[PDB]
């Protein structure tokens, strides 16, 4: 998850010469590209703006998985989101694996694994 495609052949090639070796583009080379990257998506401006208006977490999880194949880890949510009083704080905390019946604040981000296009 953290290094990114830590295959043993990379280990061997780095071990042999203690440096990264550039390679010519091949269909196999471009094939090894296809992976998944960690990303944060904002609810307000994305296609799923409607599901940000208090929609359930599971509904948006299913919608992202069915169409875009996006696996949502959890919610990166404003610290003062539950505060009824206005607040200018921009610090956000992490909710890991939220339940299906989770209300979604419109100003929340989602951790996800975006596919390569």
């Amino acid at each position: 998850l953290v290094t990114g495609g830590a295959t043993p052949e990379l280990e061997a090639l780095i071990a042999e010469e203690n440096a990264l070796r550039g390679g010519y583009s091949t269909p196999q080379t471009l094939a090894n590209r296809d992976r998944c990257r960690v990303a944060q998506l904002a609810l307000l401006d994305g296609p799923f703006a409607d599901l940000g208006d208090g929609g359930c977490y599971g509904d948006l999880f299913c919608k992202a998985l069915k169409t875009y194949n996006m696996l949502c880890f959890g919610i990166y949510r404003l610290r003062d989101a539950h505060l009824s009083t206005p607040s200018q704080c921009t610090k956000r905390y992490v909710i890991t694996n939220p339940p299906y019946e989770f209300e979604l604040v419109p100003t929340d981000l989602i951790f996800c694994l975006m596919q390569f296009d």
Binding site: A15, E16, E17, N18
Partner: protein, 199 residues
Amino acid sequence: LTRSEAAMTVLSGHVVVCIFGDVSSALIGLRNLVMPLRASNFHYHELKHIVFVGSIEYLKREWETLHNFPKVSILPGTPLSRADLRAVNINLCDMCVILSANQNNIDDTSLQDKECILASLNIKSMQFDDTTGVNIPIITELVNDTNVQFLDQNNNNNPDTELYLTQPFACGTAFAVSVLDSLMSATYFNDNILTLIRT
């Protein structure tokens, strides 16, 4: 010699001396290694081309007593580098010497031979395309007898076996420095033993 230049030059049937030296490190007196290989008893074609792999800063210190020898080459680098050994054609060498230089450290007791064991296993684990790394003739200097048992990692032996019963010592792959103290004791018991050994 650079890596590319050493690769370009054909130097098969050579002797590789892999050393771990530094400006602060104490001199090991490499001349005493090159002199017996440069005896007049051999013909000129009999002489083996000697190539040093180690830090050039240390070789410059050691170079004063080495320039007067016929066929000696120096490849700056490190023994633990795989590419450096590839350039030297270490799979075609007559003998690869691992010297326990940088001896001035007294780190723990057996940790002094960390680099020698690492380099030995690194050479043994290599693969080559025209062979393996095991068939390469290697002589490694070790200061702790137990460390010798680490050389034959593939083979299993009892921890209680003596130094002389181990396969790396029996095959002559590992040179333990305790033999010098044994030689000192033998010389005490008989003055002629040292004279014969030196001659």
